Write a protein that binds this ligand. Structure first.
Ligand SMILES: OC[C@H]1O[C@@](CO)(O[C@H]2O[C@H](CO)[C@@H](O)[C@H](O)[C@H]2O)[C@@H](O)[C@@H]1O
Ligand code: NAG
Ligand code: NAG
Ligand code: NAG
Ligand code: NAG
Ligand code: MG
Ligand code: MG
Ligand code: MG
Ligand code: MG
Ligand code: MG
Ligand code: MG
Length: 364
């Protein structure tokens, strides 16, 4: 870990981070649409936080939880979502289950903490939201689910920007066996790939891509929906669509390509409620330990001396460097701010808010 600077001063009047207010928001997202908030340049209290959220468990990975208290970070990145009861074990670090394959991958290389907490069920409304623009482009609007149902994707699929799920009306019109539904595709997209053959006594046997469906496809290579595991920081690329439920039978070019709601596959849901509270997950990413101005107020930090006349590494109101400090009478401190810069933008002076002493800073 990068050590704390020998001369360190915090910015004195920063606002509270209010992490608990965000975690306790009653509009709780599902893992499908996990929410992120970045906290910076503010003071937080881990001890208070764990009491104000009804914490069940808190632990850290690649970091010592006990070292958070009294520390400063460049930023704290918080991700959160309600936990479907059946998926809880998916959140073990490194797990290949549904939550981390297809909704939210917990980064195991960063310094992070995982907080398990809960909210009273009667006040909670789950926000299930499909993040996939291509799903939405072709018909997906909302879920229609009980209160406290929490959606999760099982399988995600990506497509390129020329994707369209509907067979071409001109192609479908001559099919006699297994005619696909059809519609016009947007300009700049390619119609669903389809072929007509004879076979046995079927003169016009039509088959298109992604059969039986993109999850169980006989031939993934010819299906334009491509399996995709979520990476760190990503959301599900999209539910696979049953292309046989996109368009309409005998649809012409006057109907726009749209997939029925039940065409979107590979997802499920479970309640988050146990003991009449909704169980929630949050992940903390700790960026730049022992730097920055996102600082714990859990401790009465006893401010140390401003060591003078010696080369010193410093972290002053968020700005870092090394130099020699020499105390000066106030007359020689040529500015009104707590830091003093030269023509080239380098720090040449410092006022200590703790003592009101003023210092020149020289290079080592
Ligand atoms: O006797 C000079 C003495 O004063 C210091 C501050 O303690 O420097 C100040 O005085 C100089 C004026 O002659 C300025 O050039 C300088 O910028 C100002 O800070 C010391 O640096 C010096 O020993
Ligand atoms: C939760 O809901 C109940 C009933 O709807 C209400 O009485 C209570 O004040 C709510 N709690 C909060 C914190 O809003
Ligand atoms: C939503 O689901 C319920 C069943 O839980 C059903 O009765 C209702 O018709 C559905 N509404 C819509 C708009 O699909
Ligand atoms: C999308 O993939 C298909 C592969 O069948 C290809 O024909 C099409 O040109 C691709 N579009 C882009 C923009 O890469
Ligand atoms: C942080 O915790 C300390 C130690 O109990 C307390 O003195 C201080 O008031 C707390 N600050 C906030 C903003 O909760
Ligand atoms: Mg804030
Ligand atoms: Mg296609
Ligand atoms: Mg292949
Ligand atoms: Mg399942
Ligand atoms: Mg995070
Ligand atoms: Mg001087």
């Amino acid at each position: 870990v990068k050590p704390v600077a020998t001369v360190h001063r915090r910015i004195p009047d920063l606002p509270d981070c209010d992490i608990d207010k965000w975690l306790n928001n009653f509009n709780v997202p599902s893992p499908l649409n996990w929410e992120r908030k970045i906290f910076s340049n503010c003071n937080f209290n881990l001890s208070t936080l764990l009491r104000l959220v009804h914490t069940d468990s808190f632990s850290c990975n690649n970091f010592d939880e006990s070292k958070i208290y009294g520390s400063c970070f460049k930023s704290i990145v918080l991700d959160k979502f309600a936990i479907p009861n059946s998926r809880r074990s998916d959140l073990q670090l490194g797990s290949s289950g549904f939550l981390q394959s297809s909704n939210y991958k917990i980064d195991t290389t960063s310094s992070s903490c995982q907080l398990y907490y809960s909210l009273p069920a009667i006040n909670v409304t789950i926000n299930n939201y499909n993040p996939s623009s291509w799903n939405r482009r072709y018909g997906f609007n909302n879920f229609n689910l009980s209160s406290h149902s929490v959606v999760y994707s099982r399988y995600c699929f990506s497509v390129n920007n020329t994707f369209c799920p509907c067979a071409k009306p001109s192609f479908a019109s001559s099919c006699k066996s297994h005619k696909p539904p059809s519609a016009s595709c947007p300009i700049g997209t390619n119609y669903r790939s389809c072929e007509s053959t004879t076979v046995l006594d079927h003169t016009d046997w039509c088959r298109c891509s992604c059969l039986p469906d993109p999850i169980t496809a006989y031939d993934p290579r010819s299906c334009s929906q491509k399996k995709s595991l979520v990476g760190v920081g990503e959301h599900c690329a999209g539910f696979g669509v049953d292309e046989e439920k996109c368009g309409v039978l005998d649809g012409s070019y006057n109907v726009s390509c749209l997939c029925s709601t039940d065409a979107f596959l590979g997802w499920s849901y479970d309640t988050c409620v146990s003991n009449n509270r909704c169980n929630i997950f949050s992940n903390f990413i700790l960026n730049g330990i022992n730097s920055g101005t996102t600082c714990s107020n859990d401790l009465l930090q006893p401010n140390t001396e401003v060591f003078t006349d010696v080369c010193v590494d410093y972290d002053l109101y968020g700005i870092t460097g090394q130099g020699i400090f020499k105390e000066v009478s106030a007359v020689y401190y040529n500015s009104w701010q707590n830091l003093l810069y030269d023509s080239n933008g380098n720090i040449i002076g410092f006022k200590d808010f703790v003592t009101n002493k003023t210092y020149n800073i020289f290079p080592c």
